[PDB]
Design an enzyme around this catalytic site. Structure first.
Site, PDB file in Angstrom:
ATOM      1  N   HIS A 163       0.774  -1.248   0.000  1.00  0.00           N
ATOM      2  CA  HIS A 163       0.000   0.000   0.000  1.00  0.00           C
ATOM      3  C   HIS A 163       0.806   1.300   0.000  1.00  0.00           C
ATOM      4  CE1 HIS A 163      -2.887  -3.035   1.425  1.00  0.00           C
ATOM      5  NE2 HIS A 163      -3.834  -2.240   0.962  1.00  0.00           N
ATOM      6  N   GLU A 186       3.386  -2.454   7.158  1.00  0.00           N
ATOM      7  CA  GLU A 186       4.231  -2.224   5.987  1.00  0.00           C
ATOM      8  C   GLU A 186       5.485  -1.445   6.360  1.00  0.00           C
ATOM      9  OE1 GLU A 186       2.231  -1.106   2.419  1.00  0.00           O
ATOM     10  OE2 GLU A 186       0.752  -2.722   2.577  1.00  0.00           O
ATOM     11  N   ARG A 188     -21.703   9.492  21.636  1.00  0.00           N
ATOM     12  CA  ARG A 188     -22.281  10.721  21.115  1.00  0.00           C
ATOM     13  C   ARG A 188     -23.732  10.451  20.773  1.00  0.00           C
ATOM     14  NH1 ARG A 188     -18.009  14.549  19.337  1.00  0.00           N
ATOM     15  NH2 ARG A 188     -16.014  13.437  19.474  1.00  0.00           N
ATOM     16  N   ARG A 196     -15.238  18.378  25.359  1.00  0.00           N
ATOM     17  CA  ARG A 196     -16.697  18.352  25.311  1.00  0.00           C
ATOM     18  C   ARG A 196     -17.329  18.456  26.699  1.00  0.00           C
ATOM     19  NH1 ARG A 196     -17.593  12.018  23.397  1.00  0.00           N
ATOM     20  NH2 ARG A 196     -19.830  12.280  23.847  1.00  0.00           N
TER      21      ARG A 196
END
EC number: 2.4.2.3
Lengths: 250, 225, 250, 225, 225, 250
Positions: F5, F77, F165, F220
């Site tokens: 990849h 990788e 959430r 939050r």
């Protein structure tokens, strides 16, 4: 010795094949004294062992210490030394309002809220007591006039969150155990303790016989506090019952 | 009817507080025939029920059908109608070499390899029999001279167990069947008494036996009234 | 016979390769009658089997009894006898307020709240219906003018706590199922029944085709009670749909 | 007493905020002997406790007994009495070929193969040591010239591990014991600091070492006051 | 932007209610090119989105990135913006001997070997496709003469599946990929319609195929507007 | 290239054995620029790789993309290409009220709320950071004057329900995660992110070293919204810290 922890040789047992296994080494001598020729064998860590004689047969009394891992060591080494029948004696709190201080509990099987039992059998396997042992314990209790409850015990790897106690440092109980006490109460569970899941599972899966009796010395669901003899008289009675049960199992 | 499946009313029970729950209607009739005043009450799907009497007291006999799921319906609805003690009788094989065809097995607790038991209690909770029931079955077996073994039974949903049998043999398991885990768990976690007995009809290695197990469950029932 | 329970030989089926599998043996003859040459084959326990002919092909109708373990026996023995396509027909309650009595449900897959399915595939595997069967059922429903809902069914090993019913002896539902109905409703689950997790999983994992249709005869989320024909007209329609679907699958 | 098991009151601690928690009373006394003003406080079942002082500050040493369950009682009750930092010292084998008898292992986190840790946090939560404690143990080990390895320890309920060891070796696990998973999980999920050090006393392949680990835990304690 | 990751507003969708969700931006552009009025909307991290039109109706094409976790963000945020139907197209290998390179697979449901699906429904709930979507994909495949297989796909988090493949082959599983379990579960448990199609590009034993799968997903989309 | 990849050969790395691994390819060049001879290697999907030099040693910067599956590809990788030390740099929200925007978090271990980690080690295994890496990160933070919190991170396979959430399309959170945020807060968990369970577990079980640092750009649990530089100044600081930590690990 020929075992890792107990510091005992097979000859020390004198052919004994039944052991009474309290949690606390301090309780060992008192149990051994009810019988003939009480002799202290050894004392290593929380493993105090005495030998005695009942109707001419050698019997062992040996403490397990607290919790399944300690208990599994005691039981496995005792089994290595030839013990084939194990009677657990304890004092306990109850979680049913109708169970009173001074009552006696005989456990048919336990809820496996521990880890050590899983080394001996998968969770699907029942932490069940041997029938002869349970019968002997129920009959010994009846003989003494004890008010007796026979049924399921919850066996926890902790004293605190696993028994859903909130009076702790953190005041927190993990999700798994939030609301668990009310669930066990609804399911008719009699009490909590910490060793029986291991004791019963390892015995029931290995061809050994085990039973468990306990005297109720407190009930957290009753507001009345246990009398001055919060333990004593009840502890004495429970010990009498376990010895008398052993007499029927020899 | 007072219940969704069984086709029975409270009145049909005439005060009965104990039920014997075998798997099939053929066995129901055989059990009822051993008691006084047997009367067939209803038959709907898997659930065929009779009323009878022991020592002047009404007793129900009702088939459960196959498996924990149908068993769970029969037991619940009978509880709704007032039954508080349940005795199952079956016939099974054995998996221990020392157990002989013709011997009687009384189950102290079951290995929970079923699905329905989980609908009553989490896996940690033992599928354990009631002590009075277990005692009554052992006493009844002894009273007719039966060779009896008392211990653990493995209980699963498949007629082809697993999907661990060598494992169960090494752990001392006596035998296999399909309904005990559900019966015992649902009773022990709900304030109901239950017991389980089976006659051994096959084993490696090494109706008479069914008849004897049937007599034993009836005589145990008598002791529990 | 050449199977353990059904009391059937392969020749009894006359080369049939499709079976309609209701739960209740009492429903068997009524389904077989919609077709040609209805002939009763056998009746053992809750396994009542009839053979019939549809467009010149032999078709079987055989009851499964209640629950996954009974169902697995019926399906496995029928598959042994050559059945390769299974159509489940039922009547059911709904758990969605917008689904009305008289409506028809076709199940694409089921929530596996059972145990028997696990003997055929691990839980990760979907209890999914065959596409040809589902298509046939949806098309047959449309042909009849039925109001049809296509989607997920919850398949439970119990009628009571697994369907979160509280009107029971104990009035208790175990933690796993407390609040479960509202969760399945929010997830768009149509209804509960007790056999499909096993039927669909065993077929989907063994190269067999299965589908399921059910007529709604009650809705516990609506306060209106089902009409006098709480079942009848709807049961009739569901049976018509399953036979017409079978015609497309021969 | 202020607590159910240990036989101690808050006053007994004299303001102590750190405890050293080995498994057995013999080791407790040896650790206490390294510090100033050692005083034996109580001994009840598995739990033998002493008070001592480092740099003028009180420190507790208390045995845990065997396994997570008894450890969980000691740690909770000590927390109730005001302890906020816990250091365990043990002696263990090793399972990596490059680890030598005499080397010192400092545990960054444990493989949770125990039962009691689940009573504090679900399995997904890491049984991880506090960074300050781990740092103090490594620094203390370096200061006495010890050969030190820092990494993962496998922690189970059995003295006969499993009921996966080749698996653990291939995953880099250093060693096995029975209490760290519970200690680390119960502390890391409850706002308490914990660290774990052990001296290596056996390995395949290839009191002095106990004494050195004991000195290291005491010198780490000093850095954490 | 109206959403945390995609960089889009409701207005950007121009009333679109269906999205095609392949894994990578290269495929997004190819799909968009098949439709009317294609317009690139945004590109942020893994999420490249275009708008286009079919039969006068707006449709979104948006890449998901690799795996259930990134897929779950794209699907949620698109739902927030008004999308109610999701079609995934991929290219995969096959694991059944009768499936040929060039064939088209339409997934009825997935084996849930991923982690993210559990964040929407417990394991018992089926990762099942919507019936209308599955029907539209099969119909579209038939309309271009594609050889089509309809059935189960295994869906995992690893590009090196497992960490059971012979097992999956024996259970009839068609192929393996990484996103379908999450997509199908999160949609089927949240009132959203989803379907999944893939072109076969390799198999033991025995852009043309990508192009054909891409045309099929677009023609299925047309039927679902 | 010699990996699936990343589109890199081993020679591209020039013997580099440490990689800094941000999530977002857009962040890659900015990190590489802090070092000597920043050179872009490749760009494929969300895998953008640059090479640079730090104290004369080759260092790689390579993005992981979002989530464990993408991360596992990048890490495996890169490890194939010779990378033995991995430093994750991120920006994050906090879930503890006392942790402020602008603060720096260094992760000792993560709660494994993902799936990809399970391919590398069973759940019992800890998602733990390497000690040298964590030390380097904590020291680099201190050197810069950063307010630093050292502790546990929750690593979730979702951004939405796994972080509990409710401001979502469905407004629903599955039972497993209902009330989970308050539980993690009580257990002292600092923050949520999505990649570290995989990164830390695969490294800790494969002989590789990993650590993770993140700058807090939102909280939050505080009602005050993050300043205009909701990210910038903090992002810059976090990048400075990770490079300075890498300098100590070469």
């Amino acid at each position: 010795s020929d075992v890792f922890h107990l510091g005992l040789t097979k000859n020390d047992l004198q052919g004994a094949q039944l052991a009474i296994v309290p949690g606390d080494p301090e309780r060992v001598e008192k149990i051994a004294a009810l019988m003939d020729k009480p002799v202290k064998l050894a004392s290593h860590r929380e493993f105090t062992s005495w030998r005695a004689e009942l109707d001419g047969k050698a019997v062992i009394v040996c403490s397990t210490g607290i919790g399944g891992p300690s208990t599994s060591i005691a039981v496995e080494e005792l089994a290595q030394l030839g013990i084939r029948t194990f009677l657990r004696i304890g004092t306990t709190g109850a979680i049913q309002p109708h169970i009173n201080v001074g009552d006696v509990l005989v456990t048919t099987a336990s809820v496996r809220l521990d880890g050590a039992s899983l080394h001996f059998a998968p969770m699907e396997f029942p932490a069940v007591a041997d029938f002869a042992c349970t019968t002997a314990l129920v009959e010994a209790a009846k003989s003494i006039g004890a008010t007796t409850h026979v049924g399921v015990t919850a066996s926890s790897d902790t004293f605190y969150p696993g028994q859903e106690r909130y009076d702790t440092y953190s005041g927190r109980v993990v999700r798994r155990f939030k609301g668990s006490m009310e669930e066990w109460q609804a399911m008719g569970v009699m009490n909590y303790e910490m060793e029986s899941a291991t004791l019963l599972t390892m015995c029931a899966s290995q061809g050994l016989r085990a039973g468990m009796v306990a005297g109720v010395i407190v009930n957290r669901t009753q507001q009345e506090i246990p009398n001055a003899e919060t333990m004593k008289q009840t502890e004495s009675h429970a010990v009498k019952i376990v010895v008398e049960a052993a007499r029927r199992l020899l």
